[PDB]
Motif scaffolding. Structure first.
Motif, PDB file in Angstrom:
ATOM      1  N   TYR A  80      -1.053 -11.892  24.006  1.00 44.39           N
ATOM      2  CA  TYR A  80      -0.606 -10.430  23.810  1.00 44.39           C
ATOM      3  C   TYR A  80       0.763 -10.136  24.916  1.00 44.39           C
ATOM      4  O   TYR A  80       0.619 -10.617  25.769  1.00 44.39           O
ATOM      5  CB  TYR A  80      -1.824  -9.539  24.002  1.00 44.39           C
ATOM      6  CG  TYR A  80      -2.851  -9.792  23.012  1.00 44.39           C
ATOM      7  CD1 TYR A  80      -2.596  -9.792  21.626  1.00 44.39           C
ATOM      8  CD2 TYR A  80      -4.282  -9.820  23.230  1.00 44.39           C
ATOM      9  CE1 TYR A  80      -3.437  -9.980  20.390  1.00 44.39           C
ATOM     10  CE2 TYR A  80      -5.232  -9.890  22.467  1.00 44.39           C
ATOM     11  CZ  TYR A  80      -4.797  -9.885  21.001  1.00 44.39           C
ATOM     12  OH  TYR A  80      -5.881 -10.327  20.110  1.00 44.39           O
TER      13      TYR A  80
ATOM     14  N   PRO B 202       3.018   4.069  25.986  1.00 45.76           N
ATOM     15  CA  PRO B 202       3.381   2.531  25.689  1.00 45.76           C
ATOM     16  C   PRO B 202       2.720   1.721  24.296  1.00 45.76           C
ATOM     17  O   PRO B 202       1.629   2.640  23.765  1.00 45.76           O
ATOM     18  CB  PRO B 202       2.568   1.867  26.772  1.00 45.76           C
ATOM     19  CG  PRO B 202       1.527   2.816  27.324  1.00 45.76           C
ATOM     20  CD  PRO B 202       2.018   4.238  26.968  1.00 45.76           C
TER      21      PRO B 202
ATOM     22  N   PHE C 116       1.494  -1.839  22.095  1.00 44.08           N
ATOM     23  CA  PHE C 116       1.027  -3.260  22.365  1.00 44.08           C
ATOM     24  C   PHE C 116       1.405  -4.159  21.261  1.00 44.08           C
ATOM     25  O   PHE C 116       2.091  -3.844  20.335  1.00 44.08           O
ATOM     26  CB  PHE C 116      -0.633  -3.262  22.199  1.00 44.08           C
ATOM     27  CG  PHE C 116      -1.553  -2.633  23.483  1.00 44.08           C
ATOM     28  CD1 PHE C 116      -0.858  -2.642  24.688  1.00 44.08           C
ATOM     29  CD2 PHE C 116      -2.697  -2.004  23.058  1.00 44.08           C
ATOM     30  CE1 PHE C 116      -1.423  -1.967  25.560  1.00 44.08           C
ATOM     31  CE2 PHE C 116      -3.315  -1.562  24.091  1.00 44.08           C
ATOM     32  CZ  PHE C 116      -2.801  -1.380  25.403  1.00 44.08           C
ATOM     33  N   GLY C 117       1.136  -5.428  21.783  1.00 45.54           N
ATOM     34  CA  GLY C 117       2.206  -6.504  20.902  1.00 45.54           C
ATOM     35  C   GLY C 117       1.177  -6.939  19.598  1.00 45.54           C
ATOM     36  O   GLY C 117      -0.059  -6.416  19.590  1.00 45.54           O
TER      37      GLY C 117
ATOM     38  N   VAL D 158      -8.552   0.737  25.199  1.00 48.01           N
ATOM     39  CA  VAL D 158      -7.980  -0.242  24.428  1.00 48.01           C
ATOM     40  C   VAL D 158      -8.713  -0.541  22.959  1.00 48.01           C
ATOM     41  O   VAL D 158     -10.033  -0.795  23.388  1.00 48.01           O
ATOM     42  CB  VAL D 158      -7.801  -1.558  25.354  1.00 48.01           C
ATOM     43  CG1 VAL D 158      -7.138  -2.516  24.382  1.00 48.01           C
ATOM     44  CG2 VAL D 158      -6.678  -1.358  26.350  1.00 48.01           C
TER      45      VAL D 158
ATOM     46  N   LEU E 171      -4.294  -5.680  19.301  1.00 42.28           N
ATOM     47  CA  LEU E 171      -4.668  -4.338  19.969  1.00 42.28           C
ATOM     48  C   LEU E 171      -3.870  -2.980  19.860  1.00 42.28           C
ATOM     49  O   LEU E 171      -2.746  -3.001  19.658  1.00 42.28           O
ATOM     50  CB  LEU E 171      -4.346  -4.889  21.587  1.00 42.28           C
ATOM     51  CG  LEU E 171      -5.088  -5.849  22.388  1.00 42.28           C
ATOM     52  CD1 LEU E 171      -4.507  -6.113  23.766  1.00 42.28           C
ATOM     53  CD2 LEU E 171      -6.593  -5.976  22.475  1.00 42.28           C
ATOM     54  N   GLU E 172      -4.690  -2.033  20.087  1.00 38.03           N
ATOM     55  CA  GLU E 172      -4.384  -0.541  19.858  1.00 38.03           C
ATOM     56  C   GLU E 172      -4.451   0.219  21.191  1.00 38.03           C
ATOM     57  O   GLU E 172      -5.740  -0.023  21.716  1.00 38.03           O
ATOM     58  CB  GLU E 172      -4.760   0.130  18.628  1.00 38.03           C
ATOM     59  CG  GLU E 172      -4.298  -0.888  17.267  1.00 38.03           C
ATOM     60  CD  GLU E 172      -4.804   0.058  16.262  1.00 38.03           C
ATOM     61  OE1 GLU E 172      -5.755   0.846  16.082  1.00 38.03           O
ATOM     62  OE2 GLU E 172      -4.157  -0.364  14.928  1.00 38.03           O
ATOM     63  N   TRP E 173      -3.556   1.041  21.342  1.00 37.28           N
ATOM     64  CA  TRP E 173      -3.680   2.004  22.513  1.00 37.28           C
ATOM     65  C   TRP E 173      -4.280   3.604  21.926  1.00 37.28           C
ATOM     66  O   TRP E 173      -3.762   4.088  21.303  1.00 37.28           O
ATOM     67  CB  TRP E 173      -2.418   2.023  23.252  1.00 37.28           C
ATOM     68  CG  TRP E 173      -2.601   2.694  24.553  1.00 37.28           C
ATOM     69  CD1 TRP E 173      -2.736   2.447  25.728  1.00 37.28           C
ATOM     70  CD2 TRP E 173      -2.106   4.229  24.615  1.00 37.28           C
ATOM     71  NE1 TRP E 173      -2.689   3.303  26.773  1.00 37.28           N
ATOM     72  CE2 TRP E 173      -2.313   4.510  26.169  1.00 37.28           C
ATOM     73  CE3 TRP E 173      -1.519   5.146  23.935  1.00 37.28           C
ATOM     74  CZ2 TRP E 173      -2.175   5.710  26.501  1.00 37.28           C
ATOM     75  CZ3 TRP E 173      -1.526   6.367  24.484  1.00 37.28           C
ATOM     76  CH2 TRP E 173      -1.663   6.926  25.725  1.00 37.28           C
TER      77      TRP E 173
END
Lengths: 313, 215, 217, 413
Positions: B91, B100, B102-103, C37, C45-47
């Protein structure tokens, strides 16, 4: 009009410390007078926009079928295709005239789109309704005897007007185009309005450069005084620094009140020429323009109205 | 913000080679000398760990085979020498723009030689036959690659109804795959049939592996 | 040693609210910020969001507005996450992470993970059956045995071999959803000296219903 | 906000209009002190505890840098005869930061210790040791009379009375040259018109308090000439980014947020300044890393209300601040009354699509009034009625009906 400003004493003098705010309240009403003086400027700047820009409360517009009697009025009329309402002369007028310390620039009450809607209402009555819309209801005046009233006021009979209608249409349409060619090159004719910006440019840059000066104190930063000296020893050096910053505010507000007395003296001369020269015929010499007065065309600008004086020479 | 996109989705690197996986950014993350990128490795069933911070440096506790490089919007992840315990998801993350992002993720596998599966079929226990059901479950273990087919033929007739397949991730030590198949049928269908044939289709064997029992 | 603690699995119906717990220890609670997360399998992954615990001020994603509500507890040093009306796409793996701030913000520490399954189904205790071949063709020197775990909810379930005696030669297989139920199988390969000596049994511990099923092969 | 109107105006009643109240206060939460990790202690006890010192004509000048020290055993714990400070607060010596310290070890008798201060005049204060007006530091003294004295007098240290001109400060005089008053050559010895400049101290226990020897070490502090070295064991904490907090960075303070830095800077740069000559950017002391400083607490509080005999409803005008990120009043910040203007967010007022004549001005074309179960509404100010008149060559309007209108104009005198 000028630029409406407001200056807080809290963020300007104090560096957000509890020692500076406790010593500010011992001086009392020194910042009571300065906040009420800059408020009283900003009320009177909006009163200068009411007495000059809007003479009448009724909005007049141009008919879609336009016969002007041989004149080209399309440069002083606004463009309906643009989203802002602007004429061809005022496109040239707008382009030639161009923080964290608690210094807030107030926005004006009357936007530039609403200034030009006062301008296009008065130009619609000057072309069509004539001189009579400023007194009572507007009268419908045709164009051929509309120019005969301006000649009969200066002592010219109607024999001169009707024979010269080809000759007047060549001279008047070339005279409006010399105004647009002069403002596209020479920018110093609008420099009286550029001095209004430059007086407010040096005034807002006055209070910025005073904060770097120590004003007799050992340091110009309030975090570098109270932390670097004793609390008995800091009360001498901070109270010299606030008194130097109170005198910097007393030079600023007194300069703005004298310039408010100058700009309201010019706005009373501006509202006189909107009433006397634009709305009717005036016999005055070197007031409505040099020579015998015919009519006047107001054009909106930043912080002023550009006058167009049609004269008989 | 900045949307990260990694290519490709899956990568198979043999033991002893160098892997390169790129995380591309839409805008420049370079500011204040040190740009902003982190690399995260997450095993299945495990939380991710911190590996590379600020792209020129290495976190203590992470071995020296994990490294990265690159400048601008093009970054490289240089992993060498590749080991069998390195198979996991990778990642990438930027702290530059708020909020922000994420990949997308990239799965790394180890390419080795192919192996033949072990086929064993189990008849159901008598505790399930007390309740009235039956489950004929055949196990297929220790095979590479993951492309395989399980054929269920009851008494010479192929029946694909009621077949449930479960495939796993790559093993750390063995580096192989495993797949099970479950055939669930009633007790009245259990006594009327006899032969249950578990067949396997793999690329190494032309003929299928026949493993069956008789009731 | 700073370690974040989360419970294993939570069960909630769609339309209701669910609450999660992230426990911080070994470091002061108001000195860091907490990040959440979200991991959906196959998407990545997601925030979710980021909260200053001392001021109780939240920073959230634009898509995730009004779904999540972040509150903290400064007395117990435990951060919370509250979700409002989850959907079928909201079933994922949730993490909490401490962000240590020096220049760039990395993720220093992580939690144990929480799998939230959103559905209207009820918790079912598992039905565990043994799997034995019953005979041998004597073509191999080792013995293959297995277990069958079916009829349970929610996933994951803990399947151990002889209470965790054999840590080698075991295989764990994923569950398949059929008719609001889960089914997984497991396998082991033991040598022929061990199998008459020791009895291999199926030890299945369901953490949701707290029911341990012991079935001998 | 009705009660905040009366506090600024200092009046019991509130008239009809827009009034300016106050400004935004953002309280800081945490504190950030960044200090590099130094395991070396400063050797200040070498020059303090030594038996043998030097004299006033040539002293021992030692440089102490790149270490940490403890001023609680020097200042707070005090087995010292005289401690004095001038430009630095003596209480805050463990707090504040400086670059280097120059300790000058010398012994001056108790009659002559009154000339040590900036801007003095004396025998030692002119031709030996001067303190300039910009000198920064402290003076530490201790009573040596029970140790360093002698019954027959101590001739081990000597001092200079005489010099031809005024000596520059921070300079040692090693010259053995005899002062020549007249035109007669001295030839290295005293004689006619020749004085012997370097005499010996008077130290005996049998005299009074003026002849008592004092070991005097004067410390010299340098502020903001360089990044700091010595400092003190204040605190070390991690950074907090994108939050308004109190800053302390290498002794320099401030209030604001930490943001990224896109500008190329010098590697030796401690900090930098904006157009307002205050710190917009800082370098971390521990490792070389740069975060900008953007200050907080900007914008005013404006209220919009009618008179107190009408209603209690007060509309709140924010000036120049976007309300999407957000005074102790949180009730009108809930939303659904929020309308976006050029001047800022207007809350407590319901925006309508009609166009009327208003009373209380706001700005940028948006104006408010009190209209009808009644609430303050805001809209765009009408210009009056619209008239569309057709104009042609063959039409004229001559009025057939007359009236007399009487108006009233008031001019003050």
């Amino acid at each position: 009009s000028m630029t409406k400003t407001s200056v807080d004493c809290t963020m300007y003098i104090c560096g957000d410390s509890t020692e500076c705010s406790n010593l500010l309240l011992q001086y009392g009403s020194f910042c009571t007078q300065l906040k009420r003086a800059l408020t009283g400027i900003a009320v009177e700047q909006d009163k200068n926009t009411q007495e000059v820009f809007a003479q009448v409360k009724q909005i007049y517009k141009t008919p879609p079928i336009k016969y002007f009697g041989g004149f080209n009025f399309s440069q002083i009329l606004p463009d309906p295709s643009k989203p802002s309402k602007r004429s061809f002369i005022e496109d040239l007028l707008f382009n030639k005239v161009t923080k964290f310390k608690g210094l807030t620039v107030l926005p004006p009450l009357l936007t530039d789109e609403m200034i030009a809607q006062y301008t296009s209402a008065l130009l619609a009555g000057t072309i069509t309704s004539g001189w009579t819309f400023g007194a009572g209801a507007a009268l419908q005046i045709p164009f051929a005897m509309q120019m005969a009233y301006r000649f009969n006021g200066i002592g010219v009979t109607q024999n001169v007007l009707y024979e010269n209608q080809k000759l007047i249409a060549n001279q008047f349409n070339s005279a409006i185009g010399k105004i647009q060619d002069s403002l596209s090159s020479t920018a110093s004719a609008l420099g009286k309005l550029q001095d209004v910006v430059n007086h407010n440019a040096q005034a807002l840059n006055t209070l910025v450069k005073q904060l770097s000066s120590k004003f007799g104190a050992i340091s110009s930063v309030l975090n570098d005084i109270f932390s670097r000296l004793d609390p008995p020893e800091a009360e001498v050096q901070i109270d010299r620094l606030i008194t130097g910053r109170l005198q910097s505010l007393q030079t600023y507000v007194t300069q703005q009140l004298i310039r408010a007395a100058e700009i309201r003296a010019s706005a009373n001369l501006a509202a006189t020429k909107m009433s006397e020269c634009v709305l009717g015929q005036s016999k005055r010499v070197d007031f409505c323009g040099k020579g015998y007065h015919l009519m006047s065309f107001p054009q909106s600008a930043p912080h002023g109205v550009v006058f167009l004086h049609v004269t008989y020479v | 913000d900045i949307v990260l996109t990694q290519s490709p989705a899956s990568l198979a690197v043999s033991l002893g080679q160098r892997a390169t996986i790129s995380c591309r950014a839409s805008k420049s993350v370079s500011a204040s000398v040190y740009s902003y990128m982190h690399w995260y490795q997450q095993k299945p069933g495990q939380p991710p760990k911190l590996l590379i911070y600020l792209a020129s440096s290495l976190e203590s506790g992470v071995p020296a085979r994990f490294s990265g490089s690159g400048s601008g919007t093009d970054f490289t992840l240089n992993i060498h020498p590749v080991e069998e315990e390195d198979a996991a998801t990778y990642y990438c993350h930027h702290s530059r723009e708020l909020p922000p992002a994420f990949g997308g993720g990239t799965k790394l596998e180890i390419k080795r030689a192919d192996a033949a599966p072990t086929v064993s079929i189990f008849p159901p226990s008598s505790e399930q036959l007390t309740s009235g059901g039956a489950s004929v479950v055949c196990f297929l273990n220790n095979f590479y690659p993951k492309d395989i087919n399980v054929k269920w033929k009851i008494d010479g007739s192929e029946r694909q109804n009621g077949v449930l397949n479960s495939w796993t991730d790559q093993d750390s030590k063995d580096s192989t795959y495993s797949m099970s198949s479950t055939l669930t049928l009633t007790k009245d269908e259990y006594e009327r049939h006899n032969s249950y044939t578990c067949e396997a289709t793999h690329k190494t064997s032309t003929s299928p592996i026949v493993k069956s029992f008789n009731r | 040693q700073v370690q974040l603690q989360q419970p294993g699995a939570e069960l909630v119906r769609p339309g209701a609210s669910v609450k999660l717990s992230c426990k911080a220890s070994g470091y002061s609670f108001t000195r860091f910020w907490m990040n959440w997360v979200k991991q959906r399998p196959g998407q990545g992954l997601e925030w979710i969001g980021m909260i200053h615990p001392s001021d109780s001020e939240t920073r959230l994603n634009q898509k995730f507005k009004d779904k999540a509500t972040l509150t903290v507890d400064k007395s117990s040093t435990t951060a919370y996450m509250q979700l409002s009306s989850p959907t079928s796409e909201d079933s994922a793996v949730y993490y909490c992470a401490r962000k240590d701030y020096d220049y760039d913000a990395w993720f220093a520490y992580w939690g144990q993970g929480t799998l939230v399954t959103v559905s209207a189904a009820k918790t079912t205790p598992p039905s565990v059956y043994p799997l034995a071949p019953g005979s041998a063709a004597q073509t191999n020197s080792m013995v293959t045995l297995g277990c069958l775990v079916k009829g349970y909810f929610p996933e994951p379930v803990t399947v151990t071999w002889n209470s965790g005696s054999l840590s080698s030669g075991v295989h764990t297989f994923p569950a398949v959803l059929q008719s609001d139920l889960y089914t997984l199988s497991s396998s082991v390969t033991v040598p022929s000296s061990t199998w008459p000596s020791e009895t291999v049994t199926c030890n299945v511990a369901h953490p949701a219903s707290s029911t341990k099923v012991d079935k001998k092969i | 906000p009705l009660s905040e109107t009366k506090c600024t105006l200092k009046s019991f009643t509130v008239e009809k209009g827009i009034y300016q109240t106050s400004n935004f206060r953002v309280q800081p939460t945490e504190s950030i002190v960044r200090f590099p990790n130094i395991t070396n202690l400063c050797p200040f006890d070498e020059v303090f505890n030594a038996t043998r010192f030097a004299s006033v004509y040539a002293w021992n000048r030692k440089r102490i840098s790149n270490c940490v020290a403890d001023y609680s055993v020097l200042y707070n714990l005090a087995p010292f005869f005289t401690f004095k400070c001038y430009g630095v607060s003596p209480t805050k010596l463990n707090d504040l930061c400086f670059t280097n310290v120059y300790a000058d070890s010398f012994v001056i008798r108790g009659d002559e210790v009154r000339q040590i201060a900036p801007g003095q005049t004396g025998n030692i204060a002119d031709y030996n040791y001067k303190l300039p007006d910009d000198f920064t530091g402290c003076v530490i003294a201790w009573n040596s009379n029970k140790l360093d004295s002698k019954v027959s007098g101590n001739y081990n240290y000597l001092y200079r009375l005489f010099r031809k001109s005024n000596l520059k400060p921070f300079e040692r005089d090693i010259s053995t040259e005899i002062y020549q008053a007249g035109n007669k050559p001295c030839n290295g010895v005293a004689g006619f018109n020749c004085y012997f400049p370097l005499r010996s101290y008077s130290f005996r226990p049998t005299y009074g308090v003026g002849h008592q020897p004092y070991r005097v070490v004067v410390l010299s502090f340098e502020l903001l000439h360089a990044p700091a070295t010595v400092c003190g064991p204040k605190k070390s904490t991690n950074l907090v980014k994108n939050k308004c907090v109190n800053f302390n960075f290498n002794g320099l303070k401030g209030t604001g947020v930490l943001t990224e830095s896109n500008k190329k800077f010098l590697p030796f740069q401690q900090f930098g300044r904006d157009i307002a000559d205050t710190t917009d950017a800082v370098r971390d002391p521990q490792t070389l890393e740069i975060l900008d400083i953007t200050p907080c607490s900007f914008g005013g509080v404006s209220v919009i209300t009618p008179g107190t005999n009408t209603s209690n409803q007060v509309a709140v005008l924010y000036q120049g601040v976007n309300c999407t990120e957000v005074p102790t009043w949180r009730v009108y910040s809930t939303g659904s009354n929020v309308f976006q203007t050029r001047a800022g967010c207007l809350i407590g007022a319901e925006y309508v699509n009609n166009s009327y004549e208003c009373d209380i001005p706001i700005g940028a074309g948006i104006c408010a009034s009190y209209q009808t179960s009644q609430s303050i509404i805001a809209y765009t100010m009408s210009l009056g009625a619209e008239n569309s008149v057709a104009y042609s060559n063959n039409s004229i309007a001559i009025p057939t009906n007359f009236t007399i209108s009487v108006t009233t104009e008031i001019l003050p005198v």
